[PDB]
Subunit: 315 residues, 4 copies
Amino acid sequence: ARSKIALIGAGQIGGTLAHLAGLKELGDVVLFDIVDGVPQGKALDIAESAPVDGFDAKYSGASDYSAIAGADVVIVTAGVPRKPGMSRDDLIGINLKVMEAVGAGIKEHAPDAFVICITNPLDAMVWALQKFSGLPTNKVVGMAGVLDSARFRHFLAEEFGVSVEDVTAFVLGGHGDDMVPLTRYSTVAGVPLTDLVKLGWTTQEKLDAMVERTRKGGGEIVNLLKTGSAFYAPAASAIAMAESYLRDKKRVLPCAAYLDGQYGIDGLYVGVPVVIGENGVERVLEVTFNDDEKAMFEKSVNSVKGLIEACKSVN
Amino acid sequence: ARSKIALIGAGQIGGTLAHLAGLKELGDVVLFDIVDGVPQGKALDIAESAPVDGFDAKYSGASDYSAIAGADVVIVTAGVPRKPGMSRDDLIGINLKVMEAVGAGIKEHAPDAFVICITNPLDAMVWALQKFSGLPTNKVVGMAGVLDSARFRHFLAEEFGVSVEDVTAFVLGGHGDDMVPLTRYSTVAGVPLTDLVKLGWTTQEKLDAMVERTRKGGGEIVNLLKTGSAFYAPAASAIAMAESYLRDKKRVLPCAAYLDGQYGIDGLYVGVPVVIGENGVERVLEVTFNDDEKAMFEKSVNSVKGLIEACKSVN
Amino acid sequence: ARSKIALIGAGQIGGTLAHLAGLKELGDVVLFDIVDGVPQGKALDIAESAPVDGFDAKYSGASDYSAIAGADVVIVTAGVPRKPGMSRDDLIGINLKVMEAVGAGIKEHAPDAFVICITNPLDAMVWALQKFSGLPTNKVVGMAGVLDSARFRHFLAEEFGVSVEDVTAFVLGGHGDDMVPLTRYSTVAGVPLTDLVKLGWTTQEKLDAMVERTRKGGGEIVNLLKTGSAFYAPAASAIAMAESYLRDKKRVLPCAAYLDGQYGIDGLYVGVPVVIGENGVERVLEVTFNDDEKAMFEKSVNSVKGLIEACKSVN
Amino acid sequence: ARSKIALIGAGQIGGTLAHLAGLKELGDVVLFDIVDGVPQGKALDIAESAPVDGFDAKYSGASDYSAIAGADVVIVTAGVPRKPGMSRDDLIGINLKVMEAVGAGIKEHAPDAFVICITNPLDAMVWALQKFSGLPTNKVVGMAGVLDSARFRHFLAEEFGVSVEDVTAFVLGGHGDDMVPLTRYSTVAGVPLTDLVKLGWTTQEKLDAMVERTRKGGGEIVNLLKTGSAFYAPAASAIAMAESYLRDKKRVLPCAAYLDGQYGIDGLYVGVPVVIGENGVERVLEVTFNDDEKAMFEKSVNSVKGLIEACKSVN
Ligand SMILES: NC(=O)c1ccc[n+]([C@@H]2O[C@H](COP(=O)([O-])OP(=O)(O)OC[C@H]3O[C@@H](n4cnc5c(N)ncnc54)[C@H](O)[C@@H]3O)[C@@H](O)[C@H]2O)c1
Ligand SMILES: NC(=O)c1ccc[n+]([C@@H]2O[C@H](COP(=O)([O-])OP(=O)(O)OC[C@H]3O[C@@H](n4cnc5c(N)ncnc54)[C@H](O)[C@@H]3O)[C@@H](O)[C@H]2O)c1
Ligand SMILES: NC(=O)c1ccc[n+]([C@@H]2O[C@H](COP(=O)([O-])OP(=O)(O)OC[C@H]3O[C@@H](n4cnc5c(N)ncnc54)[C@H](O)[C@@H]3O)[C@@H](O)[C@H]2O)c1
Ligand SMILES: NC(=O)c1ccc[n+]([C@@H]2O[C@H](COP(=O)([O-])OP(=O)(O)OC[C@H]3O[C@@H](n4cnc5c(N)ncnc54)[C@H](O)[C@@H]3O)[C@@H](O)[C@H]2O)c1
Ligand SMILES: [Ca+2]
Ligand SMILES: [Ca+2]
Ligand SMILES: [Ca+2]
Ligand SMILES: [Ca+2]
Ligand SMILES: [Ca+2]
Ligand SMILES: [Ca+2]
Ligand SMILES: [Ca+2]
Ligand SMILES: [Ca+2]
Ligand SMILES: [Cl-]
Ligand SMILES: [Cl-]
Ligand SMILES: [Cl-]
Ligand SMILES: [Cl-]
């Protein structure tokens, strides 16, 4: 009866998720992959690390979905990268097929799980995974906003020369051009960034550049690493979501969540602040937008709609 | 060369400070008191607890100030309680005498320390302790606002049904009638409390009652315990300040800090948000007040002035 | 569905248990006492500390046993101290009456709990509490040996100048003259203390003195504090036991456990190494004694028998 | 003045070291590599993860050694893998050249560092790195034994069904055929494994198989992963060593250490238990061997001698 965490995909993010789940003593971990040996090896390596910090957790790797039976949390990173010669449709086609298999596995073996999707393109993959698995919409979420929040917080803390603990970033929507930052609901110690510009703690230009840097943040890591994308911050972000579920913390975190009318939207996964507790997505915090924000949010949702239409077109 | 933390006063708060410093692996601890046996016993008890969690720290107790030599941080709780038959002047008279002795001990033995005063009445005792010790004003601070922030955060998190991690409370000034809350710079996930009332997440009345409950918070604990005042939250609050110094975190925390013109004030210790790092109080965040806040802050400073005048009157 | 920890007794150890349970994020906490106000005040103080470290836990205080309903773990410190004018029989008489009330409360309200008794005299109180509550014998244990282990580990680590993390102490039986140390199964980095004497890392005399100091350890703290007994190490020790249950860690810890024939003993609570997991006391590790150890253990069990007979005599 | 940790090599182990150093709040981190972009990207990714857990640490990546200036700890993983078409001499030739460059960089820029070598073949690379850097022999160590200890502890804990926290493994020498296990100084709760066989908690055959599995442990991970070797347990192991230095914990850990006559050996790096504190390798624990162990240790040292001779032959 420790909690059981199944990690579907045992690649860069999945290994990191597994390591964090151990260090944080969140429970037992099953790593799943289609590449045999990989999840077993990473599982055993992490298991062998455990006596150094003293965490007691069972680790195992598998390529059969029976291994995930009764998982409390399932975190999905399974899929393929968009190689330079691949279309968007190609990628969606491929990773939709992966979501199909993953959804079937969760449906059969872990129907009571809280599912956190990470696989790109996230706002479509999470939507697809919920549909394929049939799980309740409040029990399937996507990680995206926490990562954007984390990047922006790092840039802010560096700018102001203050602890990351005292910075808050408010972001909705998706990544990149689909991100909807509210600098007025972003703060240092409760003071909004817009007021910090008035105080002269920063400048409008520096603030705008930090917002843009957050939009571009994923690509900035790709451009440095060259062989892959970011994994430490993505994994940390999803573990925060998982921990909030497992420990019923009721964190308020921006995640891709199924909207039943909130923000004027019905039937789509959109990045919004949600309370995560033992019942999954328990409430959506719907803020009041100004005009600039309404228009940014509308673009962002249209982007999601266009990708969902591409999914239906390819499946 | 581990950091050295000296705790001047080994009573309710001082024991708790000592326990937290161990658990958090902040360094070696010296407990100091005039009651012989007390600091030695608590030190040894905590030392004996250490193998259970695995923290390596030296613990000792003393009643001679040579024991605090070279302390990196000194946290002062030494003093007496205001027994029902004691005046304010009586208390100040008594605890000023204690600050005199403590200041002399720090001056001689730990002149390079970051000093955190807790002893009441705080805004006067911290002012007195800086004067008696001669330490640089940026290296002597008082704990008060963090405690108020913590209480208000607890009440907010309970009200909204969210994690304490996603609530921010902005408080300046002192405790009780001297507290200067800014609900507009208090937030859930970046959203100000004033906006949460507009969203219907709470009500104005409930918000006002939580502010009042924070004002009264110390007395609320006294009224429950009957034999003494709060100690767990006070100790946690001061340890946050200490940790920010020791780990150069540059937390932004409301503390009683010496103002050199900020907030229009020169030569007084006033509760304000400060960045705490390896150089002590490194910057004061001076916010822009609305009218209600200016007047509340002016009352609060006048209160401090009146207590400083009472000190001079009694010493 | 967070775990629920009920702390029966909200005095020195009980407050400390409550604080540790928060810091370690073990779950929700209910403090129970007959002195109204005390558990409510300590609960609220700890709750108010929580936003400083970011632990999400509900805290409450009560003087009605309905408050403990559904507790996963119950830790019992309720009782009175042996004031200088009180007999052993007096104390047992009094604290047996307390165990009667506590056992009735657990029986009615938390029948599925893992119960950890701390109240003295421990080997009798734990036996009595199991009988009064009717809970399964594997779900009721007493804390004693972990504390002795912790003290001895502290003394060893100081002697050898090594980390507390690399010292192991093996103790069975009770405290004081009833303690049964096995220095040959006590180690630094796996090397037994008896071999460390041969290596010249210490001396036989120093080793014997550390054993004696452990026997006397509780009194050593009393003699320093004067107003009460140890509480930081006692609380840490019991929390280790609780955590092993709650997280199914299967720690091997010396505890007062009900023996069903192990060590040649049937029907008594005796200090022995036990594996603690989600099923309670899951296995007893029965070591093979040398002659000196057999005789020490036999004395220790006879001591327990004599105290159980005194209980029956007074109840 | 936070501690500064330089990680020379930003590959599989180096990234993991960097992540752990953040999570454990050990200090600022510089990742160094010859592949430009890699250390910068991993540094930035980890930095961006920090606001999720709240660790304050500066992260940077570099390919110039000036970046490591004033490092308190330097952990070396730089080097190349032994590709299937490469000799032992080839590998040594190559990685000796890497140690030459790394040693020069440490000499010039971080002469006061505690250096932890990980690069294979470890017992030669650590010896070479000390010679190239000129640092004091007590300030240069190799990680190997902690990893073996950790693997064996995992296997033991699984065998006995107990917490990893209560298992101790005693290993000297190197990996594989060069490992020198002492099962008699390996324990569960202080009870030696040899006694646990007598108690019937395991069997001689199972114990022997766990020893052999530890010998083969690195290869077991390679055989599962196929693309590389273990990294989570290796990184955890070295971080334990680093933390012991940085926090002056005086852990007793099996590491490749320069022997000045201990174990009968002068002038070689050999795996032995050492106390690690703020002065580096502060003491070597020299145990007394039985005959089987003496012969195993002699083989193991001869193996080291043969590799040192191969180094001199290739350099
Ligand atoms: N949501 C976000 O904010 C965010 C941020 C970063 C990365 N990502 C996305 O996360 C995903 C994972 O990234 P990564 O770096 O771990 O990738 P990776 O390529 O290292 O890992 C993916 C793993 O999935 C496995 N896999 C492939 N097909 C599978 C199947 N049918 N079933 C099970 N497993 C399968 C692969 O074998 C591989 O081990 C990618 O799609 C990436 O774009 C998302
Ligand atoms: N700043 C705040 O927000 C805040 C909040 C709570 C409590 N307080 C104050 O903190 C202080 C400590 O509270 P507590 O509950 O620990 O009190 P306590 O009475 O338990 O402890 C005070 C200790 O100081 C010792 N002492 C007395 N005179 C001394 C001297 N001359 N030198 C050294 N030690 C001496 C006493 O022996 C005692 O052990 C009190 O003044 C209290 O009002 C402040
Ligand atoms: N087992 C060990 O190794 C060990 C070590 C140290 C202390 N102890 C024992 O632990 C016990 C607690 O010590 P402490 O320092 O916390 O004591 P304490 O006196 O501070 O606390 C005891 C609490 O129990 C309460 N209480 C009294 N009667 C009660 C009842 N009928 N129902 C509920 N609550 C009641 C009291 O009001 C008090 O708050 C003592 O018996 C002590 O001897 C055991
Ligand atoms: N001691 C042990 O117990 C143990 C256990 C496991 C692995 N290892 C060894 O640890 C080492 C690192 O393993 P890994 O998985 O991280 O390897 P890796 O190949 O992922 O990383 C090595 C890094 O070193 C870099 N590098 C190469 N030449 C360099 C130079 N001249 N200067 C600076 N950087 C350079 C590479 O670019 C690469 O990023 C390997 O030699 C491996 O065999 C040791
Ligand atoms: Ca632990
Ligand atoms: Ca609406
Ligand atoms: Ca530790
Ligand atoms: Ca101004
Ligand atoms: Ca947390
Ligand atoms: Ca038997
Ligand atoms: Ca923190
Ligand atoms: Ca010798
Ligand atoms: Cl270890
Ligand atoms: Cl323990
Ligand atoms: Cl805080
Ligand atoms: Cl977060």
